[PDB]
Every structure is written in C-alpha cells, then in structure tokens.
Write a protein that binds this ligand. Structure first.
Ligand SMILES: NC(=O)c1ccc[n+]([C@@H]2O[C@H](COP(=O)([O-])OP(=O)(O)OC[C@H]3O[C@@H](n4cnc5c(N)ncnc54)[C@H](OP(=O)(O)O)[C@@H]3O)[C@@H](O)[C@H]2O)c1
Ligand SMILES: O=C(O)Cc1nn(Cc2nc3cc(C(F)(F)F)ccc3s2)c(=O)c2ccccc12
Length: 314
C-alpha cells in the first residue's frame, strides 16, 4: 500500500485529490475518505480549500480515528511564490490553513514563476501570463531550506519535464534530491518516457487526473472522455469493477502513486476499493495502447513562459 521515498519515509500509493472540491463539501469528503481508509491527501494553496481540508484532518485526529504520523499530507508552492523570499511564507500559510506543523511532501506546483501578487494567474491586457524573473534552481534551493527547518519532510516537483528534473539533479551543491514528480497520467497520456526517466533516477511518480478530470473547467464536449470510453468499460465489466476502479488500478500496477479526486461519498469509497483485484498483462498492454498524448492540464496563456514544460517531447 505504500512506496519508499529517498528520505526513508513511506508514501501511500492511493491518495485523495482536492482540486475543484468546494470548501464545505471537501470537509465532508476528507472525513469520509479517512473513515474508509485513505491516509494520503493531495492539497494545494491554489485549490482555495486548504482551510476546509484542515478542518477535516483536525477533527479526525481529535475523534482518535487516526494519528498524525499515519497521514501523508501533500501540498504545493504556487507559481506566484517562486521568489526565494516568499517560499517559507507560502509554506507556512499552507501549514496554518491545514492546521499542521509539518507537511509530508511539498512540491513546486509548476516549473514557471508568475508575477507576485494577489492574483494566482496574473495576465497582461492581451491575456498572456505575466512571468516572474525566477528560476528553477533558486526556487529549489528555497524548498531545500524548508526541509532543513522542519516544515516539510520531503520536497519534490510537479509538471517538470525531464530536462527540468535534470537541472535539479545536476545542481552543484544540491542538498536534497526531488522525492517525487507529480504529473498528469492516464491511458490517453501514458508518459512512458518521463516515467522511465524518473524511476531510473529513483524519483517516485504520482499520476494526477487519472480519471481524465471530467470536471476540469475548460472541457469541451468533443474532448475524449476516459470514464465513458467503451473499451475501458469492457475491461472493467470483465473484472466486475467500475471504469474508475480500472483507471485507478492501472497506475498502481506501473509503480506509480495515484490521486483520484471526488467529493461524492459513494465514489470516495468506490475509488478506494482497488487492492482486491489485478489487471492482467493484456489489460495493461491494452490500456497503454490508448495513448494519444492528450493533456487535461496545459494552460494556453502560459505557452510563452520561459519555463513552459510541454514544448519538449518529455
Ligand atoms: N500537480 C498538478 O498540477 C495537478 C493538476 C491536476 C490535478 N492534480 C491533483 O490530482 C487530483 C486528481 O485530478 P483531477 O481532480 O484533475 O481529476 P480526476 O481525479 O481525474 O477526476 C475527478 C472527476 O471525476 C469524478 N469522479 C471521481 N470518482 C468517480 C467515480 N468513481 N465514477 C465517476 N466519476 C468519478 C469526480 O466527480 P465528483 O468529485 O463530483 O464525485 C470529478 O468530476 C486533483 O484533484 C489534484 O489533487 C494535480
Ligand atoms: O495546477 C493544478 O493543480 C491544476 C490546474 N491546472 N490548470 C492548468 C495549468 N497550466 C499551467 C501551466 C503553467 C506553466 F508552467 F506552464 F507556466 C503554470 C500553471 C498552470 S495551471 C489550471 O489552469 C488551474 C487553475 C486553477 C486551479 C488549478 C489549475
């Protein structure tokens, strides 16, 4: 149920996603998740609900349902806080909202820095994102400091391409290697080269949007839909499992961590019932065959940012 990281800690391979979970619904979602066995929650300041996740964790610690050490809480540094002088503050805001005294894992959410300010997506008058003059290595150095101060137990990255990961690995005077790279991954974006790269470097990969993020705010009717894919439905029926369970089990069998999101109590429970079956070799082969290099998360207004990750092949 857990994978070993480079800091010696164990990370649950199944966690609960919280992007697009509205504040109060998310408090109940986390309480239910904890009750049915989730021990990893994936959070972010930019999801605007960390206080409400915090409420849930606090209450279940209080109810004596779980201990803090049994939980694996992840959050992420948003793009507008990449300046070295803003990182600790950003982390401490997350810690305050989550009502925690440490995070198990803290990620650089995206490799690009954005102009500091109240707005999470600062745009100019023609709709281009406004970058900041920050770079990956300086931001990484600031993340390292959080480990040395005890605010976070591990640090890692998200939406980094292999060249961007290499920049960190090859930093002279590197203090901590990235523990995790959290990237989009599902049957329509199978990430074979980046996953190979990362695993060969002892970096654990977490798959986000494993169900294809049907609630993403920029979905178009014509877009491919994983949960509705009749080929995957047929694989699921064969196992007497739902399509969602097949989609969650798939990355587990590639030695990935996976973080499906739900605020629907029955689905929260359903998505955790994935340790009692196995996809076969043919199933695995078939699911990888559906790759189309189709991305849920890739914001158009950021495509000219110096650090845009997805111009590179991988
Ligand atoms: N690091 C990054 O840049 C990044 C980017 C995107 C996502 N992520 C993380 O990854 C998580 C997962 O990605 P995601 O939120 O994009 O989408 P996802 O987990 O692929 O899909 C969530 C959508 O699927 C629905 N759903 C969940 N379980 C279902 C089931 N059993 N049957 C049918 N529908 C189901 C949910 O509906 P209800 O909630 O209404 O039940 C919601 O609409 C996020 O929440 C976030 O924590 C990280
Ligand atoms: O962020 C999430 O967890 C999900 C996520 N994804 N996207 C697509 C993005 N594409 C990006 C590209 C860059 C870039 F690095 F390329 F500049 C930087 C930042 C982004 S946000 C969003 O637009 C978004 C908006 C609010 C909350 C979460 C998200």
């Amino acid at each position: 149920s857990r994978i070993l990281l480079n800091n010696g800690a164990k990370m649950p391979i199944l966690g609960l996603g919280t992007w697009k979970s509205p504040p109060g619904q998310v408090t109940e979602a986390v309480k239910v998740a904890i009750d049915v066995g989730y021990r990893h929650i994936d959070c972010a300041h930019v999801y605007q609900n960390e206080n409400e996740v915090g409420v849930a964790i606090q209450e279940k610690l209080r109810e004596q349902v779980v201990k803090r050490e049994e939980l694996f809480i992840v959050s992420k540094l948003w793009c507008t806080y990449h300046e070295k002088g803003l990182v600790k503050g950003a982390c401490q805001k997350t810690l305050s909202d989550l009502k925690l005294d440490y995070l198990d894992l803290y990620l650089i959410h995206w490799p690009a820095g954005f102009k500091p300010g109240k707005e999470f997506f600062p745009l100019d008058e023609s709709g281009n994102v406004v970058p900041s003059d920050t770079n990956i290595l300086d931001t990484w150095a600031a993340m390292e400091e959080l480990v040395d101060e005890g605010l976070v137990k591990a640090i890692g990255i998200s939406n980094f391409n292999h060249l961007q990961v290499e920049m960190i690995l090859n930093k002279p005077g590197l203090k901590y290697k990235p523990a995790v790279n959290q990237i989009e991954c599902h049957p329509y974006l199978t990430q074979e080269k980046l996953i190979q790269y990362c695993q060969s470097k002892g970096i654990v990969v977490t798959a986000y949007s494993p169900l294809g993020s049907p609630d993403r705010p920029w979905a178009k009717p014509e877009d491919p839909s994983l949960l509705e894919d009749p080929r995957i439905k047929a694989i699921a029926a064969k196992h007497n499992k739902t399509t969602a369970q097949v989609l969650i089990r798939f990355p587990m069998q590639r030695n990935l961590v996976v973080i499906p999101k739900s605020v629907t109590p029955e689905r929260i429970a359903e998505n955790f019932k994935v340790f009692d079956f196995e996809l076969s070799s043919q199933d695995m082969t078939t699911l990888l065959s559906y790759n189309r290099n189709w991305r849920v998360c890739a914001l158009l207004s950021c495509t000219s940012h110096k650090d845009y990750p997805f111009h590179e092949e991988f």
